[PDB]
Amino acid sequence: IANQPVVIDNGSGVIKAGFAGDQIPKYCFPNYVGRPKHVRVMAGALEGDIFIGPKAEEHRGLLSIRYPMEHGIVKDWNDMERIWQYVYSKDQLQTFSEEHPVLLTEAPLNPRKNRERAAEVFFETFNVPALFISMQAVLSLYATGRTTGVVLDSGDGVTHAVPIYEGFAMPHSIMRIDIAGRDVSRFLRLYLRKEGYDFHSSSEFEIVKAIKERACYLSINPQKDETLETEKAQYYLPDGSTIEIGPSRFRAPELLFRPDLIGEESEGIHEVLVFAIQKSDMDLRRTLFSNIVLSGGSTLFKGFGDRLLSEVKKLAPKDVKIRISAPQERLYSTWIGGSILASLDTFKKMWVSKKEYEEDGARSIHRKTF
Amino acid sequence: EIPEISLPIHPMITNVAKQCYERGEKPKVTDFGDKVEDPTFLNQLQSGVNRWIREIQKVTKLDRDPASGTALQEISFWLNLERALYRIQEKRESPEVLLTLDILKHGKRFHATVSFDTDTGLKQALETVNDYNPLMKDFPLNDLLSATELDKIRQALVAIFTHLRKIRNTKYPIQRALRLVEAISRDLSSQLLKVLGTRKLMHVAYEEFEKVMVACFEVFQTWDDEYEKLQVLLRDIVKRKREENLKMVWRINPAHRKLQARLDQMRKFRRQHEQLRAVIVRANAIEEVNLAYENVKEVDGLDVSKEGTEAWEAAMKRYDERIDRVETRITARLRDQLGTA
Ligand SMILES: Nc1ncnc2c1ncn2[C@@H]1O[C@H](COP(=O)(O)OP(=O)(O)O)[C@@H](O)[C@H]1O
């Protein structure tokens, strides 16, 4: 028994959290940790070293922003502890980690050590009454209400497709590549350098993310538009300068459909969907093609869904109704799905109790991983 | 004997209801307004409701050994649980507690609301309480309390068991009924202990003692035949319920056979004294055997069982041997008395 389950949606770029039963996540902020770079000289300065959340975003110039999680895998656990601890601070939740069971979203095909050490972190430093690690696609489909269909997500560090059949997420059809939002921003940074504009500071990579979020689009024809000179719209920096982008705005999110530009034998998003559908039972292909759900912030580019339809039509068999849905809460899909899932009475039997974790250990988590 | 713990509510909610009490208005759910859909507010609300669930479960699942204490204690204990669980329902149905529940329902937090009735075992506890509620009211144990005459005990025993006959419709457990029966025999034994105390039985004649003896066996036979009727009663109850093949112990050693066996040994004891003292009256062996008779038997001492065996098995066979050695002469004496001529 506890108060209420807290759905903490992780993400390599933006963490999202709130209590279960909530409508929208009330607490969302970037998943980075910024510590100052300069020298504390004057007294009365910004006290404290590590900053997370709105304060780290505000005084962005001083920090040396780093990410503790990359490609859905935690690289530094200390920064993650401070991030989770920040989630439970007075600025976000104002609660205690002893009276709340925790729903935790997590990307597929990740190492066992993520669930194991993350569970140790929660049940030991936080001592939560109940932890429950789950997928992300299952939650997104629960958020849309329907039940069978694939889920195409592309967050900040991962991207995958999961063919879900009535909740049983088919584990033998989850294609997963590691080319997501942050990497698109990284490649955009490279193209900005090729344009002439240099951005290499860690607290400037964020400006590159801002440019990706408000100045890029997806060309329908990938090559016909490359053979033309666009209008070259400008961009206003926080500094007040001006950057004319040019061709570095459509080729930047082109990476998601062709990771040859980054030099990698992986596949595009369209191939992840088509391979995820084709590596399933032939009796469900039409049902999966009639139900595609997008989620994740990288599915917010202009002309994304339209280009995805064109690509899938080029790869799907002829005269099969393809249908891509795209709800208005792609950033909040996994969190809303967590709010629906954890607010049910079956969640009591679906979690892992603290007592159980102390009895068996990590094997209990891998046992009851679904 | 039963903890009745009230359900505490947050003080600010009490101040709000107090403000509405100054006016006479029903304290609405949306009186808090923005405070309703806030995190710390609902957090504290669930904390209070969660402690309430633990307070209810503190006494609903409570249970003790069915044979612990006397019969009236266990029977009264079930009665206490009945009225106490109704008082828990009283604390559940107050509008203030319902106001907190409305806060959690209006704030879309279904957890504490559904668990307030499901996680609390009060509902099933109250339904089992109601199943045993007529069975516990108007119990004729007082018929057994002031019953000193064995006839009052005969009719009392039959009355109590005929009132207990309503356990066919209320699912009575097996072992519970057997410990119940032994508790009934406990009070039967206690009543009989003081009955033998106020009887002064070690000084009466065999006429009055014979009547009292027959009355004792009357009570015992009412116990045996009516208990077999209760046995057959529970047999058909287990048949109509059709549950399993448990190893149910019917090898009951109650609290009255302990005195019944001593009575039997005294029956044959009086047979020895009957043939002797009733005829011997008819050369000092007459007197001498009554002398040694009373000399080895005048110290029964409130005839409890423990010292009964402890010293009286030796004093008992010693009385037999005192007859014998004392009566040893007559045999060969009779061989004299008549073999000479
Ligand atoms: N309007 C936008 N256009 C393109 N990309 C965006 C936009 N908004 C956010 N993003 C990218 O999407 C990512 C958000 O996905 P995220 O919520 O992190 O998924 P997860 O939380 O599962 O990691 C951010 O890293 C951001 O870079």
Swiss-Prot record, chain A:
The keyword Flavoprotein does not apply. CDD domains: ASKHA_NBD_Arp1. It comes from the Eukaryota. InterPro entries: Actin (IPR004000), Actin/actin-like_CS (IPR020902), ATPase_NBD (IPR043129). Belongs to the actin family. ARP1 subfamily. Part of the ACTR1A/ACTB filament around which the dynactin complex is built. The filament contains 8 copies of ACTR1A and 1 ACTB. Interacts with dynein and adapters such as BICD2. Interacts with BCCIP (isoform 2/alpha). This is Alpha-centractin. It comes from Sus scrofa. The lineage of its organism: Eukaryota, Metazoa, Chordata, Craniata, Vertebrata.
UniProtKB/Swiss-Prot annotation, chain B:
Residues 255-278, 309-332 form a coiled coil. Homodimer. The cytoplasmic dynein 1 complex consists of two catalytic heavy chains (HCs) and a number of non-catalytic subunits presented by intermediate chains (ICs), light intermediate chains (LICs) and light chains (LCs); the composition seems to vary in respect to the IC, LIC and LC composition. The heavy chain homodimer serves as a scaffold for the probable homodimeric assembly of the respective non-catalytic subunits. The ICs and LICs bind directly to the HC dimer and dynein LCs assemble on the IC dimer. Interacts with DYNC1LI1; DYNC1LI1 and DYNC1LI2 bind mutually exclusive to DYNC1H1. The gene is DYNC1H1. Dynein heavy chains probably consist of an N-terminal stem (which binds cargo and interacts with other dynein components), and the head or motor domain. The motor contains six tandemly-linked AAA domains in the head, which form a ring. A stalk-like structure (formed by two of the coiled coil domains) protrudes between AAA 4 and AAA 5 and terminates in a microtubule-binding site. A seventh domain may also contribute to this ring; it is not clear whether the N-terminus or the C-terminus forms this extra domain. It is found in: Cytoplasm, Cytoskeleton. It comes from Homo sapiens (Human). Belongs to the dynein heavy chain family. It is linked to Charcot-Marie-Tooth disease, axonal, type 2O: An axonal form of Charcot-Marie-Tooth disease, a disorder of the peripheral nervous system, characterized by progressive weakness and atrophy, initially of the peroneal muscles and later of the distal muscles of the arms. Charcot-Marie-Tooth disease is classified in two main groups on the basis of electrophysiologic properties and histopathology: primary peripheral demyelinating neuropathies (designated CMT1 when they are dominantly inherited) and primary peripheral axonal neuropathies (CMT2). This is Cytoplasmic dynein 1 heavy chain 1. Cytoplasmic dynein 1 acts as a motor for the intracellular retrograde motility of vesicles and organelles along microtubules. Dynein has ATPase activity; the force-producing power stroke is thought to occur on release of ADP. Plays a role in mitotic spindle assembly and metaphase plate congression. Changing H106R: In CMT2O and SMALED1.
